[PDB]
């Protein structure tokens, strides 16, 4: 059981801020040098996700 | 019967209060003498039941007393007693009296909390330390520490094992010039001898709180592993795999700045309270006071922020003014920026004078996101409360479509039928969403794009969908609670 | 001297379910009355808790003076209390919920009952015991009718400064 | 077909005031070739001198000519009950109204009823691809 | 296995409510907290739900 | 008669107070053995239209 | 209470005393002796006396 409104199972509720209704927008490709401490492999197209994922 | 009139009143038999929908759960240690069964949620009625039900001077009783003092009538209380670890070690403290009282006077102490203070008058002059240490006969029983009076030195032993007994800093304002003549020559020395060893790690929340909704969880412990388990359980309440019970939890972290920051595990479901190393009040009392105040004793309105000196005043707690702010302003800013909660005195008074603490910011220790880039969607406790309120309210509104005929292929409804189609359903929902602006939502960025309705036949491939199933997607924003304006002075001097 | 200077005490107070509950096929009802508290060696004593709730029950469960009708009433049950002729506050004791009569549909009658209930419990503010009172009544059908009464209290010691209204007198009952 | 100007669906929900009865949304059909009319801007401008105006409260109203349902008393369609209405046109527009009231009802022969409704606000759902927010 | 009510009482009440006292119109379902409430049967409250959601 | 259940409702402390030193234990000692298997429906309900059948 | 529940008229003193002072009696409930029905179900159609007068 749960909140009286959601118990009967007529409504399935999901809360999350990482979902986006709109489809993925257009694609931009960036190319350049890197240093030896970068874990990413060379000559492979990858998908960046945030600013904090850089550096590493 | 045997009376005249039309109306026949039927009074509710002793249910003098509702206290429904608002629930608070308190978890903590207990002592041997407690008659309550371990690891079993039980309802608490009032202060009379205490002591007997949860032992004398136990952590759970101390926490509960503060909760009832803040929450007098508006909420219903619950307790979840826990037992000591297998090999727990109780901490020991020493307070030695040295001098010989050569002048009649009075001695007064302050330990842990104002409720536990004492004041005894020295009999006469020339009373040695042995006749002194009568303080033991004056210490209130509720004090979690036991006194012994070992013939000149009093020993304080924690009544509960584990690390929960490593927090004290005694303030003894007698020494020095005092109108209540300090017994001349007497001096007190305070030191520790043995720390706590082991804490319990219960991990059976799914069994004892199975499918029971609680508004606020309060935990009277400082074990990081114990807190981590509580956070995991709360996540399960907000999970998408089943009906949700919602809820929020309150915990505290104590230590230096370097240590406290190390506990910020991006917990969106907890409100961690940061305290300094020299806090003159027992930790778990302040945490309980904060939880009780916000545990629906003030938060029947989901959007009410518990801050400031008017709403975030922990009145029940009294502590003497400290000689130093404790949290230097350079450190206060960092803690607030890292998702911690910081509290301080409510009024400025001279050193040693009594005051009360209040809360600066109401933050939920939320940073970053699953998708790693940062934001502040759940930066404020009110956001979590509003999000839960919106879900329940929306679910209730949609109930009217339960068991209603729906047309999806031929959208023309004959004369006399009771039904609806997708467009009419969407229009009604938009009306509800727009009407709630200023109560649960801010102004929508683009109301025409933030709400969508699609029948399951338009999502699944051919001959795979089900009849009468819809998918609703909504995006909202909580009410705005701030604004920044930059100004310029420009004092002119020319005539025109 | 000691800060506990308020010497005013509290007398007996009627309590709900003091004499248990009377059960019947329709439902269960409380039987309000006085409460006895026992010691370890006898020496019974009367309880004195929940002053305001006790005052509310007395107001509701007492027939006030009946309005003149032109045909009259028997002297036995004209209503009211003979002690009201000595008080100086210019009010009368009791309530008048039971004096309603079936008028129009049930919805109209219920609405009238609510009006009388508010008009009677309003005396609480006049005495100064409570700062506000309001009753919410819901009609759900033929047989199930529910009502709820909300009474606002205050703490014994003033804490907030700058109130629009006034600090209710006789607040030493702190409720 | 989007350029056709007409009415596609009409749902009405009645809430009797003296008994609290609620009747689910019943589809309706119009009696003649006339169409309903709308006014959504709840502020009226009066012409002052030199291009200035004056604002007055006013309301939002709807005129809804519909054919009486033979299963509902004629009194309800007049000013003896609350009304909640929805009208969907062919192009895609939807206009919803709630907590409306009937004003100055006129005599009706028993089949054709013309209702004048006033409410605090009327919400409009434009077809996909609107410009204003 | 831990049902706190005599099984034949619940079945009889459900059958009596289902298709005689509520099915003058066949199309009506018996579900939800309004049209499928067995108001004549009372059992004590309990946190444990009996059936786990996966089992349901 | 093999599905009875008895519970000590007042065990958990509540507004009601239970006497101290009193305990109640519930257990079974013998199960049911045999049930009837009537197969005479075609004769006792011969060609009459019922709406609901309840089997206890 | 039992007499009123079983359908009897009960009378008692109007004024108050316990001392042999003169008083007068009055009637508590004006109820007939009606119980059950032609079919054995229980109801209260003709419970109150005024029901008979109104029916005629």
**Closest to B11 (Cβ–Cβ): which among C29, C50, C159?**
C29
Closest to F51 (Cα-Cα) out of B386, E26, B251, E47: E26
Contact at 8 Å (CB) between D96 and D123?
yes
* End-to-end CA separation in angstroms for chain B: 91
Which residues on adjacent β-strands are paired with residue B252?
A: B273
d(CA B221, CA B165): 10
Summarize chain G as % helix, strand, coil (round to 5): 20, 15, 65
CA pair distance D70, D111, nearest whole angstrom: 8
Element (H, E) at C29: strand C28-30
| Most D CBs within 10 Å, among C107, C140, C142, to test the D interface | C107
Nearest CA in chain E to F1: E6
The secondary structure of residue B226, as a DSSP letter, is H
Measured distance CA(D67)–CA(D74) in Å, rounded: 11
Q: Find tokens 């307070």 and name the residue.
A: B95
Q: Cβ of B447 under 8 Å from any chain D Cβ? A: yes
CA distance B456 to B465: 6
Alpha carbon of residue D131 to chain centroid: 25
Whether B54 and B153 have beta carbons less than 8 Å apart is answered as no
CB contact under 8 A, D88 and B426: no
Pairing of strands B419-420, B319-320: unpaired
Question: What are the tokens at B252?
Answer: 């505290």
b/e sequence B142-156, b meaning 16+ C-beta within 10 Å: bbbbebebeeeebbb
Structure tokens at E18: 């289902």
The terminus-to-terminus CA distance of chain A in angstroms comes to: 44
* Chain centroid, CA B466 distance in Å: 45
Distance of alpha carbon D127 from alpha carbon B471, whole angstroms: 19
Quick one: which of C162, C172, C171, C165 has its CA closest to B310?
A: C162
Using left for φ > 0, alpha for ψ between -120 and 50, and beta otherwise, residue B215 falls in alpha
Q: CA triplet A43, A48, A49: central angle to 5 degrees?
A: 160
Is the Cα dihedral D50, D52, D56, D58 positive or negative? Answer: positive
End-to-end CA distance of chain E: 14
Contacts of B50 in chain F (CB under 8 A): none
Asked if residue B96 lies in contact with residue B174, where contact means CB atoms within 8 angstroms, the answer is no
Query: Which residues in chain B are closer than 8 Å to G4, comparing Cβ atoms?
Result: 1
Residues 6+ apart with CB under 8 A from E28: B403, E22, E35
Mutate to test the interface with B, among A20, A21, A51 (most CBs of B within 10 A): A21
- State the burial class of residue B199 (Cβ atoms within 10 Å of its Cβ: 0-12, 13-18, 19+): buried
Q: Is B103 within 8 Å of chain D by CB?
A: no
Nearest Cα residue in chain D from C139: D20
In angstroms, the Cα distances linking C62 to B9, B15, B72, C30, C95 are 12, 22, 30, 16, 6
Helix (H, G, I), strand (E, B) or coil at B467: coil
Please calculate the CA angle D8-D88-B409 and round it to the nearest 5 degrees.
Answer: 65
- Smallest CA-to-CA distance from B202 within B219, B187, B189, B180 is with B219
Task: Compute CA distances B323 → B203, B437, D58, whole Å.
Answer: 42, 48, 65
Compute the distance between CA of residue B58 and CA of residue B51 in angstroms, rounded to an integer: 8
As to burial, measured by CB atoms within 10 angstroms (0-12 exposed, 13-18 middle, 19+ buried), residue C54 is: buried
Is B211 within 8 Å of E47 when comparing Cβ atoms? yes
Ramachandran bin of B447, using left for φ above 0, alpha for ψ from -120 to 50, beta for the remaining angles: alpha
User: What are the backbone angles phi and psi of residue E15, rounded to the nearest 5°?
Assistant: -65, -40
Distance (Å, whole) CA D102 – CA D122: 15
Q: Examine chains D and E and say if they touch (3+ CB pairs below 8 A).
A: no
Provide the shortest C-alpha distance from residue F39 to chain E (in Å): 21
Name chain A contacts of E49, Cβ cutoff 8 Å: 1
B394's tokens:
């929306």
CA neighbours closer than 13 Å in the CB half-sphere of residue D129: 2
Distances (CA, A) of F16 to B39, B45, B301, F19: 21, 11, 32, 10
Residue of B nearest to A21 (CA): B473
Measured CA to CA, the distance from residue C97 to residue C78 in angstroms comes to 15
Contact assessment for residue B284 and residue B220, using Cβ atoms and an 8 Å cutoff: yes
Give D7-51 as a DSSP string: EEEEEEEEEETTT--EEEEEE---SSS---EEE----EEEE-GGG
CA dist., res. F47 & res. F35, Å (int): 27
* Residue environment code for C6-31, b if the CB has 16+ CB neighbours within 10 A, otherwise e: eeeeeeebbbbbbeeeeeeeeeebbe
The answer to whether B190 and B93 are in contact (CB under 8 A) is yes
After which residues does chain D become discontinuous at a C–N distance over 2.5 Å?
none
Strands C28-30 and C36-39: unpaired
* 3+ Cβ–Cβ pairs closer than 8 Å linking D and F: no
Q: Residue C44: is it exposed, middle or buried by C-beta count within 10 angstroms (0-12/13-18/19+)?
A: exposed
* Neighboring chain G residues of B1 at a CB cutoff of 8 Å: 1, 4, 28
B166, B81 Cβ separation under 8 angstroms: no
Number of residues that make up chain D: 133
CB D11 within 8 A of CB D85: yes
Tell me the C-alpha distance between A48 and A45, whole Å: 10
Q: Check: CB of residue B388 under 8 Å from CB of residue B246.
A: yes
Q: How close, in Å, is residue E25 to chain B by CA atoms?
A: 14
Question: Any idea which residue has 């009306």 for tokens?
Answer: B431
Substitution target in C25, C26, C74 with the highest count of G β-carbons within 10 Å is C74
Q: CA–CA distance from B362 to each of B273, B378, B384, B476 (Å)?
A: 10, 11, 12, 21
Beta carbons within 10 angstroms of residue G24's beta carbon: 9
Which residue out of B419, B421, B429, B453 would a mutagenesis test of the D interface target, given it has the greatest number of D Cβ atoms within 10 Å? B419
Contacts of C118 (CB under 8 A, 6+ apart): C133, C134, C135
The SS3 call for residue C138 is strand
Pair of tokens at residue E16 = 């009596």
Distance in angstroms (rounded) separating the CA atoms of residues G56 and G45: 14
Distances (CA, A) of B184 to B100, B121, B151, C122: 8, 13, 21, 63
D19 neighbourhood in chain C, CB within 8 Å: 105, 107
Q: B422-435 and B381-398 helices cross at what angle (nearest 10)?
A: 140
CB-CB neighbours of B105 under 10 Å: 18
d(CA C64, CA B245): 49
Interface test with E, best of A3, A5, A7, A8 (most E CBs within 10 A): A8
Report d(CA C48, CA D4) in Å as an integer. Answer: 79
Alpha carbon of F13: minimum distance to chain B alpha carbons (Å): 7
Please name every residue paired with B345 in a beta bridge, in sequence order, or none if there are none. B357
Q: Tell me, what DSSP letter sits at residue B177?
A: S
Cβ <8 Å between E6 and F3: yes
- Residues whose CB falls within 8 Å of the CB of residue B202, separated by 6 or more in sequence, listed in order: B39, B82, B226, B229
How many Cβ atoms from other residues are within 10 Å of residue B369's Cβ? Answer: 18
* Contact (CB<8Å) E5/F4: no
Among B208, B242, B403, select the one facing E53 at the smallest CB separation. B242
Beta strand residue intervals within B111-263, DSSP E = 118-121, 145-146, 153-158, 188-194, 216-219, 248-254
Q: Closest by alpha carbon to B88, among B272, B275, B221, B230?
A: B221
Least CA distance to C25: which residue of chain G?
G5
Mutation pick from B397, B405, B408, B420 vs chain D, by most beta carbons of D within 10 Å, is B420
DSSP class of residue C40 equals T
Q: Reduced to 3 states, what is the DSSP secondary structure of residue B336? A: helix
Query: Which of D26, D69, D123 lies closest to B430 in CB terms?
Result: D123
Report the phi/psi class of residue B368: left, alpha or beta, with left for phi > 0 and alpha for psi in -120 to 50: left
Rg (CA), chain G: 15
Distance separating alpha carbons of residues B332 and B275, to the nearest angstrom: 11
Cα separation, D117 vs B194, in Å, equals 81
Chain D residues bordering chain C (beta-carbon distance below 8 Å):
18-20
Three-state DSSP at D98 gives strand
Does residue D58 sit in helix, strand or coil?
A: coil
Using CA atoms, how far residue E19 sits from B97, B147, E30, E34, F55, in Å, is: 85, 73, 9, 16, 15
Nearest CB to E29; choose among B208, B241, B403: B403
Look-up: residue for tokens 């609806």?
B420
Which residue, among E30, E29, E46, has the nearest Cα to E38 in the 3D structure?
E30
Q: Is there a contact between B365 and B264 (Cβ–Cβ < 8 Å)?
A: yes
Quote the CA–CA distance of B130 and A4 in Å, as a whole number: 65
Look up residue B330 and give its two tokens. 């350079």
Phi, psi of B278 (to 5 degrees): -110, 40
Distance CA G18, CA G21 (A): 8
Select from B250, D16, B16, B149 the least CA-distant residue to C151: B16
Neighbours of chain E (3+ CB pairs under 8 A): A, B, F
CA-to-CA distance for C165 and C147, rounded, in angstroms?
28
Residues of chain C positioned with their CB less than 8 A from the CB of G15: 76
Query: Of B248, B254, B258, B278, nearest to B365 (Cα)?
Result: B248
Q: Which two tokens stand for residue B134?
A: 């009568």
Q: Helix or strand or coil: residue B474?
A: strand
For residue B316, count CB atoms less than 10 angstroms from its CB and return exposed for 0-12, middle for 13-18, buried for 19 or more: buried
Q: What is the dihedral of CA B392, B397, B402, B404, to 10 degrees?
A: -170
Q: Which candidate from F3, F7, F56 shows the least CB-CB separation from E12?
A: F56
Is the separation of the CB atoms in B100 and B126 below 8 Å?
Answer: yes
- Rg (C-alpha) for chain B, rounded Å, is 29
G3: helix, strand or coil: helix
End-to-end Cα distance, chain F: 11
Mutate to test the interface with C, among B3, B4, B7, B318 (most CBs of C within 10 A): B7
Under 8 Å between Cβ of B354 and B347: no
* Whether the Cβ atoms of residue B17 and residue B73 lie closer than 8 Å to each other: yes
Phi-psi category of residue B308: left, alpha or beta, with phi > 0 → left and psi -120 to 50 → alpha: left
Burial class (CB in 10 A: 0-12, 13-18, 19+), B69: middle
Chains touching chain G through at least 3 C-beta pairs below 8 angstroms are B, C
Shortest CA distance from A1: residue in chain E: E49
- Listed in sequence order, the residues at least 6 apart from B365 whose beta carbon sits closer than 8 Å to its beta carbon are B264, B266, B267, B268, B270, B271, B272, B339, B340
Q: C16: distance to nearest CA of chain B, Å?
A: 6
Characterize the bridge pairing of strands B470-474 and B118-121: unpaired
Q: Whole-angstrom Cα distance, residue B34 to residue B60?
A: 10
Q: Chain B: residue nearest C98 by CA?
A: B5
Q: Give the 3-state secondary structure of residue D67.
A: strand
Contacts of A52 in chain B (CB under 8 A): 368, 372-374
> Minimal Cα–Cα distance from B22 to chain A, Å?
12
Burial class (CB in 10 A: 0-12, 13-18, 19+), E1: exposed
In chain G, which residues have their Cβ closer than 8 Å to the Cβ of C75? none
Per-residue tokens: B246: 């919602």
Question: CB–CB of B132/B97 below 8 Å?
Answer: yes
Q: Which residues contact B115 (CB under 8 A, 6 or more apart)?
A: B140, B142
Q: What is the largest CA-CA distance in chain D?
A: 56
- Alpha helices in chain C, H assignment, sequence order: 51-60, 106-121, 123-127
| Chain G residue closest in CA terms to B3 | G28
Phi and psi at D37, nearest 5°, equal -130, 160
Question: H/E element holding D115?
Answer: strand D112-119
* For G2, nearest residue in chain C (alpha carbons): C24
Q: C104: nearest CA in chain D? A: D18
Structure token digits, residue F34:
């045999």
Q: Which helix (H) or strand (E) holds B473?
A: strand B470-474
CA E27 to chain centre: 19
Cβ pair B368, B341 in contact under 8 A: no
- Whether F15 sits inside 8 A of B45 (CB atoms) is yes
C27: closest CA of chain D, how far (Å):
26
Within 8 A by CB and 6+ apart from E21, the residues are none
E-chain residue closest to B405, CA distance: E27
């Amino acid at each position: 059981m749960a909140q009286d409104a959601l118990s009967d199972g007529f409504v399935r509720l999901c809360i999350d801020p990482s979902l986006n209704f709109f489809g993925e927008g257009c694609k931009i490709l960036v190319e350049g040098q890197i240093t030896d401490d970068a874990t990413a492999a060379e000559n492979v197209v990858t998908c960046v996700n945030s600013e904090l994922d850089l550096v590493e | 019967a045997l009376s005249d009139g039309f109306v026949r009143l039927c009074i509710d038999p002793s249910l003098n209060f509702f206290g429904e929908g608002c629930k608070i759960l308190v978890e903590g240690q207990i002592t041997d003498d407690a008659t309550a069964a371990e690891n079993v949620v039980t309802c608490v009625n009032s202060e009379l039941d205490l002591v007997e039900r949860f032992g004398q001077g136990s952590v759970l009783t101390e926490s509960l007393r503060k909760v009832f003092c803040m929450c007098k009538s508006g909420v219903s209380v619950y307790a979840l007693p826990r037992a000591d670890a297998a090999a727990a070690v109780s901490a020991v403290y020493t307070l030695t009296v040295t001098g010989t009282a050569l002048t009649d006077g009075r001695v007064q102490l302050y330990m842990g909390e104002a409720e536990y203070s004492l004041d005894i008058g020295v009999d006469e002059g020339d009373t040695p330390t042995q006749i002194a240490a009568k303080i033991v006969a004056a210490i209130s029983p509720d004090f979690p520490y036991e006194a012994t009076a070992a013939a000149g030195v009093i020993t304080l032993t924690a009544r509960n094992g584990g690390t929960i007994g490593n927090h004290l800093s005694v303030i003894y304002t007698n020494l020095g010039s005092c109108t209540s003549v300090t017994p001349e020559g007497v001096t007190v020395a305070f030191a520790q001898t043995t720390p706590g060893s082991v804490n319990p790690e219960p991990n059976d929340y799914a069994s004892v709180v199975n499918e029971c909704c609680f508004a606020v969880y309060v935990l009277s412990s400082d074990d990081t592993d114990w807190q981590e388990n509580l956070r995991d359980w709360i996540r399960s309440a907000w999970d998408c795999s089943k009906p949700q019970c919602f809820g929020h939890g309150y915990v505290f972290n104590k230590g230096t700045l370097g240590q406290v920051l190390a506990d910020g595990d991006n917990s969106a479901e907890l409100s961690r309270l940061a305290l300094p190393t020299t806090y003159p009040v027992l930790p778990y009392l302040t945490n309980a006071a904060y939880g009780a105040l916000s545990a629906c004793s003030t938060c029947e309105n989901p959007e009410l922020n518990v801050q400031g000196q008017t709403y975030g005043l922990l009145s029940c707690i009294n502590m003497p003014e400290s000689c130093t702010p404790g949290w230097e302003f350079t450190e206060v800013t960092q803690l607030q920026n890292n998702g911690f909660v910081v509290s301080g005195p409510a009024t400025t008074s001279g050193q040693g004078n009594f005051t009360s603490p209040y809360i600066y910011n109401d933050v939920t220790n939320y940073l970053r996101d699953e998708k790693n880039r940062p934001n502040a969607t759940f930066r404020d406790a009110s956001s979590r409360r509003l999000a839960a309120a919106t879900g329940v309210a929306l679910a209730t509104f949609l109930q009217q479509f339960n068991g209603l005929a729906v047309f999806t292929k031929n959208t023309n409804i004959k004369t006399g039928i009771i039904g609806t189609n997708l467009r009419l359903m969407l229009g009604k929902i938009r009306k509800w969403a727009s009407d709630n602006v200023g109560v649960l939502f801010s102004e929508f960025d683009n109301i025409n794009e933030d709400i969508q309705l699609v029948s399951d036949f338009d999502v699944q491939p051919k001959c795979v969908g089900q009849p009468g199933v819809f998918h609703l997607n909504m995006r909202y924003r909580p009410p705005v609670r701030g604004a920044r304006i930059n100004v310029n002075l420009v004092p002119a001097l020319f005539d025109n | 001297n000691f800060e506990t200077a308020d010497r005013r005490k509290r007398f007996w107070t009627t309590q709900v379910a003091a004499c248990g509950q009377s059960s019947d096929d329709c439902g269960d009802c409380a039987r309000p009355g006085l409460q006895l508290l026992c010691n370890g060696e006898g020496r019974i004593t009367i309880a004195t808790d929940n002053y305001v709730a006790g005052l509310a029950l007395n107001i509701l469960l007492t027939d006030a003076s009946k309005a003149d009708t032109g045909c009259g009433w028997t002297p036995g049950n004209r209503g009211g209390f003979w002690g009201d002729s000595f008080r100086s506050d210019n009010m009368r004791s009791g309530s008048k919920i039971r004096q309603v009569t079936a008028r129009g549909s049930m919805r109209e009658t219920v609405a009238l009952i609510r009006a009388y209930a508010i008009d009677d419990l309003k005396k609480l503010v006049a005495y100064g015991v409570a700062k506000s009172v309001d009753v919410d009544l819901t009609y759900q059908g033929s047989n199930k009718i529910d009502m709820t009464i909300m009474i606002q209290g205050v703490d014994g010691n003033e804490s907030r400064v700058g109130l629009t209204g006034e600090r209710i007198a006789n607040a030493w009952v702190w409720s | 077909c989007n350029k056709q100007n007409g009415v596609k669906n009409i749902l009405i929900t009645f809430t009797h005031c003296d008994t609290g009865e609620v009747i689910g949304p019943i589809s309706h059909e119009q009696p003649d070739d006339t169409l309903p009319t709308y006014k959504t801007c709840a502020w009226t401008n009066t012409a002052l001198t030199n291009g200035a105006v004056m604002r007055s409260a006013s309301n939002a109203t709807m005129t809804l000519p519909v054919v009486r349902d033979p299963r509902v008393p004629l009194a309800w369609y007049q000013g003896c009950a609350q009304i909640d209405a929805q009208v969907e046109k062919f192009d895609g527009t939807v206009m919803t109204l709630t907590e409306g009231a009937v004003t100055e009802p006129e005599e009706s022969d028993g089949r054709a009823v013309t209702m004048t409704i006033i409410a605090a606000e009327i919400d409009e759902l434009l077809p996909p691809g609107s410009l204003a927010a």
